[PDB]
Amino acid sequence: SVQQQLEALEKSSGGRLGVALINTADNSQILYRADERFAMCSTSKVMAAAAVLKQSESDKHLLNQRVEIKKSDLVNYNPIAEKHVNGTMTLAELGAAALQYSDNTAMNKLIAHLGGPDKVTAFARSLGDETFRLDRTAPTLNTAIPGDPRDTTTPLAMAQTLKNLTLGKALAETQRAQLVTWLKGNTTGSASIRAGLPKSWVVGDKTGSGDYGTTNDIAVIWPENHAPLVLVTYFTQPEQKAENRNDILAAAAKIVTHGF
Ligand SMILES: *C(=O)[C@@H](NC(=O)/C(=N\OC)c1csc(N)n1)[C@@H]1N=C(C(=O)O)C(=C)CS1
Numbered sequence: 159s160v161q162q163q164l165e166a167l168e169k170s171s172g173g174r175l176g177v178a179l180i181n182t183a184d185n186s187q188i189l190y191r192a193d194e195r196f197a198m199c200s201t202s203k204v205m206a207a208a209a210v211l212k213q214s215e216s217d218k219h220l221l222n223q224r225v226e227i228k229k230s231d232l233v234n235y236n237p238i239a240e241k242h243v244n245g246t247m248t249l250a251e252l253g254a255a256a257l258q259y260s261d262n263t264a265m266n267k268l269i270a271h272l273g274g275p276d277k278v279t280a281f282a283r284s285l286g287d288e289t290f291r292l293d294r295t296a297p298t299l300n301t302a303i304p305g306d307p308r309d310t311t312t313p314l315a316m317a318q319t320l321k322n323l324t325l326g327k328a329l330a331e332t333q334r335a336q337l338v339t340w341l342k343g344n345t346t347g348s349a350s351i352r353a354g355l356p357k358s359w360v361v362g363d364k365t366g367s368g369d370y371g372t373t374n375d376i377a378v379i380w381p382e383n384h385a386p387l388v389l390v391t392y393f394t395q396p397e398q399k400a401e402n403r404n405d406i407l408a409a410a411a412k413i414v415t416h417g418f
Contacts, residue, residue, distance in 0.1 A: 163413045164190045171406050173371065176392035178313035179414045180321055183385040188414045192314040195289075196392040197302035199366030200260045201316070201374045202278070202292055202309060206268040207253040207340065208323050209281035211333040213272075214249075221250040225271070231263050234297045239263035250336075257340040257364055262296035269295055282319065285328045289315035300368030302394060313390040316376055321388040324362065324378045338362055341378065349404040350375040351389055354411030358382060371400025375407045379415070387415065 168175040168190075177190040214220040224246040227239050238255035239247070240263075247255070247264075249271065255264035269275060275292040282290035292299070293308035300309075322328040324338050341362025350373075352361050363377035372394040379387040391407040 160188055160413060160416070161190070164410065167406065167409055167413065171393070171403065173393055173395040173400070173403070173406070175406065175410060176313040176390070177410050177414060178317035178390045180317050180388040181385070181418075182321070182325065182387065187314075187317075189314060192317075193312050195307060195310040195312055196374070196394055197300070197306070197308075197310055197368060197370075197372050198290075198316070198392075199300045199302060199309075199368040199372055199374055200262075200265070200296075201364050201366040201376045202290075202299060203256045203260065203265050203268075203366075204320065204323070204337075204341075204364045204376065205282055205290060205292065206265060206272065206278050207257050208329065208337055209272055209278055210249055210253060210268055211329055211337055212281060212284075215330045215333055221248060221253075223249050225249060225252060225267050227263070227267075231266065233262045233266065236261050236263035239267075253336075254340055254343075258343050258345050260346050260365065265296045275299075285319055285322055287311075287315050287319045290319065300366070300372070302368040302370045302372035303398075304370060304394070304396065313392055317388050317390045320376050320378065320390065325386055325388070338378070347375060347377070350407040351377045351379075351391060351411040353404070353408035354413075355379065355415060356381075365404075367402045367404075369398055371395035371397070371402055373402040373404055373407060375404075377411075381418070384418065387418075389414065 255261040
């Protein structure tokens, strides 16, 4: 069974695997540890970018608002923001950089604009997600310590919220479409969920990786002849310096989208 395959994958992997797939053809689900908490790592950027998109529904000037980028804003990983030191980026450009390159400075400018991590949590709650919590800025939100509740969610809660955000009721249409455009243009996901799928399927995704070999991906998938699938694959390991394991996410994606 699919469940036996996921169990075996996890057993060989040397970690803890969390999967939630929602098949929007019939609202059926494939769940594996889907009610367990995992550190989101950079997959939490989706919620921060979406919270800014929600604000933009009522402020037609927001996405073009200039944000100053300073040398002191640079952190551990900021390939886009570092190009703009001494200049500005718009909030839209920060959304794009955060989502498509996983730029940590860009995430922090979104969080600061919103008024801190707790405001990102409040936005999740406004969408009916009782599980998501953002506690820290980047990059400390990626410490991913086993059993630490900070900066966590469950696979099922994140799959439900990602479905709502990208295909459902969370955002007004122009904002929904912008979020989907951003996710489809991600550059960091080739070896994760995408690698487990037919090459021709259209995918939007957001990765995350952190300590404890924590390796995550959240995706919306558009088959050629079928309704979309929403898939969350989270993975974490017992040792702090464990290597990240994108291949496990690809393997999980292949298992749960099989035959289909
Ligand atoms: C988000 O997950 C974020 N991760 C980090 O900044 C890391 N550590 O922070 C203490 C980290 C550990 S491992 C690794 N490859 N990055 C950024 N997210 C992505 C992503 O997974 O999308 C990275 C590849 C770079 S940094």
